[PDB]
């Protein structure tokens, strides 16, 4: 049984499940401290609930919100949005690209206790528990990032919740990640290598798939084609098309790794950890928001020969098996 | 001429004896809320800061300026709570210290100015507590962003009248480069305390500034790791100059004639998460007085070296209150 922000639910209550989404991409404390940045706090919470409603109209029953502490995971703001839309939300624990000083100077012993705090006891005074552990690298692991992986693996072994990881896929990051993970004795089935549609090296994915790992093609609408005037927007979203990412799903089923795909949008309704008005530009690319998966990518795949049977396994069965704890 | 503490405004005269650089907690933003167990509990941290705050009250302190910014983890409801309990005025801080996260770092100088003025004019968070001072920092040659932070902090101060205090690596003559940016923005040296300057011995560097009109913050008087050379992490934080060696810098800056531009404080704290673990264990036994070290051990030291009580009173009451009075 899975922990959501509104309590525990059973495996089959989950349904069609986006497995890497954000409500707001921010920093810790930024939302409390400068909420005019997003218009107002209520201005943003409306923007999420409009956008979540649109996906729940499209069949989505659960999102996994992989914002960690250093992304500003306002776990109350989540459960606010989760009532008003009737979408389960699974919150995350862990650490992203930007930990603060009070994190960086901790030992792998200390980080393991904090990770188990938010899985076993609760995120802040709020009593909500996290069902997934997010971690991150961009290239070679820094010594701290190395600690984070081992602490998240030692956490994932006392609790059974899985690990999802941020990756710069162009530099075969999952390889080092999985090397570090397996050194701690974590089953490759308890780990999704994320941001993996950012590469075109299929051999790297299928090699990683074949050791047992789950592959996050969680970036399907991230494309800055049409924004070759925005320098920063092109940097954040890559020059590969959405169909280019989407086809890598079919290509990975073809190698007989349907059992191992998770698909998601990596969308967000507030974005402060990048240049200003980046959210202005991203919403014009993709008005559908988080609804881009059931409205545009599921039709596109049925148009390329993927039946409703295996689509339903990827969107319902795979996240169900992946989020259920396992000792 | 009123100043904003965390329990509403007060008048200049109400300030009294004032430590112009202190911390209740040295942390990062929401670290306290997220992992209170690192400090024992949120209760346990509040007990310990009130205890130390009453010890300094009984030695005669009324007002401390807690200069923790957003990224030192400035919990103003926490600060308001220990101000109620220990009957001590606490001025709160806006600005950006050594560790700004992504959502500040990507901001322009215009935006950062909108943010400082928000914490000065409107309030901090949803609490409606207003800041009385803008803290910024460099170590060495300013990063381009540190130039953006100094310039926006300077634009707020001209727009509001609140002073700017700073953190420096004194040994590298930072106050030279801070001052050049400040004065390039139209800001009066009277509005800027160049701090952490008892971490140098280059006396002519302090005097060169102080003549240009700046205030000089001697804000780490019991920082010294003497007798703690085997602890390499502690020796890095506190340095190897004893506390007498710093306390002399006061008397030596009085003498040069600059009694009016001298602010004195501890840079103490009751919870420290943004350094190695158990560093708070070490610091509390170097100095059991805590924030009381300036009334209890540095004041009697200076009178034995022959400073006039009328000069001491101006240093701790006339000097802070002139700094914190808003001036457009
Ligand atoms: Zn990511
Ligand atoms: Zn993400
Ligand atoms: Zn400092
Ligand atoms: Zn300080």
Author numbering:
A (entry chain B): 36 to 362
B (entry chain A): 35 to 362
What did the paper state?
The enzyme phospho­triesterase (PTE) is capable of hydrolyzing such OP compounds. The buried α-Zn2+ ion is ligated to the protein via direct interactions with His55, His57 and Asp301, and the exposed β-Zn2+ ion interacts with His201 and His230.
The tag-free C23 variant was expressed without the MBP fusion tag and purified by conventional purification tech­niques. C23_1 crystallized in space group P212121, with two dimers in the asymmetric unit. A53_1 is presumably an inactive monomer with one Zn2+ ion in its active site and C23_1 diffracted to low resolution.
